[PDB]
Every structure is written in C-alpha cells, then in structure tokens.
Amino acid sequence: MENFQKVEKIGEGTYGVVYKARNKLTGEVVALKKIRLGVPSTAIREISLLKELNHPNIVKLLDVIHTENKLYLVFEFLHQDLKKFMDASALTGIPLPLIKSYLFQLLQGLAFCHSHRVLHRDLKPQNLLINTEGAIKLADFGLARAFGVPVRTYTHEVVTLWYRAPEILLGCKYYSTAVDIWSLGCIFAEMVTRRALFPGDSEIDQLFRIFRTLGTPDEVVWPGVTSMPDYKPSFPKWARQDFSKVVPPLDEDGRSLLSQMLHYDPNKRISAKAALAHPFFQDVTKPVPHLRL
C-alpha cells in the first residue's frame, strides 16, 4: 500500500480483491491482492514461507506487506487466466499440443510444491495464469492452508466444488498432495472436452456426479472408504463409465494418464513426479497460444 497505484481490478479470489497495480517506485506492474482481515500470526508466518517457494510454474510472490487489519500480497502479473483462455478458445478448443504443454508445466509446478510438502488444495482454471510465451503458472499456492477455504468468498460468490477430490468431500481431514492431482485431472478433462467434468452445485451433487462417472466407490476400489466421516451406506451404487465416453477424443495415453490422476484411492492416484514420466508426454512441445490481449 501507498507504494502502489491501482490500475484495475482483475480478480476477486476467495480471500479478497486482486488489482493490477503499478509500483510507484520500481516501475513494476504487479497483481496486488488485498486480503480482508489484526492479522493472525500463523497465517503471517505461513505466507512468508511462500516467499521462498519459487518455480517458473508458480506465480511469483514478490512481497508480503502487513500493515493494519491489512495483508497485501504482491504477485507477478500475468495477462490472463485459463478460464478466460478456455472461454475465448471455445469454438475450436485449445489445440492438444498446447493442452499437453500446459498439463506438463502444471505437473512440474506441482512436483516442485509437493516435494516441499506444500499443497495447493484449491486448483481451478481461474487460478492458472498464462502468458504470451506459452507458460502457465499456478496462483494462490499455499493460501488455503494459511487461511482456510471458505464456502463463500468475501464477495459471497460461491466457492466452486467442481475440482474437489472425493476424500475432501467424504470428510477426510488430513488429505494429501493427491488432492491437487485430482483437481488437475478435472482441469485436463475440461480442456479436452470444453466442458467441466464434474460441475457440482452442492457437496452431495459434486460427489454424486463423480460417482455417476467413475462408479460409486467401494472397499474394492478404495480400501477404507466406507469408514470415512461423510460416507453413507445409503449412497446410490452407480456403475463406472468408460473414459472413452468421458474424454473423446483424447488418445489412449491421455486416457491412461487421466484415469491414474482420477483414482479414487489417494494412495493409488498418480503423483506429479510419476505423471511427468508418463508416455503421454513423450512428444510434448511448448507451443505459443494465440492470445488476444
């Protein structure tokens, strides 16, 4: 604050408004997130850890400014998010090579964060940001654990459930890096089909949409599921569909990979590091998007 000229709003994440801003010294143009709330010290301490978790696929946290009831996070500015790009690209879709490049890069971002035991917990197309040179980067990494995840944002807009892993929906309190692999799998499926995979509009709806596509989980596919807090014996028991029906026209390597990322059992679900070795990525390249900013 003080030091920043606000130039436009670009965002209203769960925790507060994001503005494009110019630093009145450095020249530099940044995204300034003004987080509403003085400030609880554990979150300060947590957020500050984030200043060292740097990777070319993680949106750089430039500075943390704590002043009153006032927490501003100053990030690297990128000029659009994947949801806007997807919307823009709807008539033809994102070309597969670009989809592949984006998935590859996000997995790298995740492998990095995961290797330092940092989870995102709330990946969604809105927090995947892209630039003109064919990069894509994860934003808001680590903010969920620092703060919480609320059911509504500061604006009352509802927090999307569409990318939530089933172990979170079933009440697992101590979930793992696997939850980000689930989310990125849903996002990969959405890029390919141009439709969200599981667009739930409540927690039961989200879970039943998952069950309807992947089969109601049981003790066979997921040891320990029926003991989870929010598991009920009364869930309907739906059959698994083929992936071939779910993500046409993804090829067999794509489908193989997606299936591994969407394993019910978080223990069996593919890691980011293992995903990077999958044959899907054998012919990966780094195309430039056509970007109309």
Of the candidates 109, 131, 127, the one whose C-alpha atom is nearest the C-alpha of residue 118 is 109
User: In the complex, what is the shortest distance from the CB of residue 77 to ligand F18, in angstroms, rounded to a whole number?
Assistant: 4
Part of the chain binding ligand F18 (CB under 6 A), chosen from 70-78, 185-193, 205-213, 214-222: 70-78
Is residue 122 annotated as a catalytic residue, yes or no? yes
Please work out the total of residues on this chain that contact ligand F18, with binding judged by CB under 6 A. Answer: 16
User: In the complex, what is the shortest distance from the CB of residue 283 to ligand F18, in angstroms, rounded to a whole number?
Assistant: 30
Of the candidates 127, 284, 99, the one whose C-alpha atom is nearest the C-alpha of residue 194 is 99
Residues from 121 through 150 that contact ligand F18 (CB under 6 A): 129, 139-140
**Is the Cβ of residue 11 or residue 217 nearer to ligand F18 in the bound state?**
11
Nearest-5° angle of CA 26, CA 31, CA 36?
Answer: 120
Q: Which of 63, 87, 122, 253 is catalytic?
A: 122
Should residue 113 be labelled a site residue for ligand F18 when binding is judged by CB under 6 A? no
Part of the chain binding ligand F18 (CB under 6 A), chosen from 71-79, 111-119, 151-159, 282-290: 71-79
User: In the complex, what is the shortest distance from the CB of residue 84 to ligand F18, in angstroms, rounded to a whole number?
Assistant: 9
**Is the Cβ of residue 137 or residue 269 nearer to ligand F18 in the bound state?**
137
**Is the Cβ of residue 79 or residue 116 nearer to ligand F18 in the bound state?**
79
- List of residues contacting ligand F18 (CB under 6 A): 10-11, 13, 18, 31, 33, 59, 75-79, 81, 129, 139-140
Binding residues for ATP: 10-18, 33, 76-78, 81, 124-127, 140
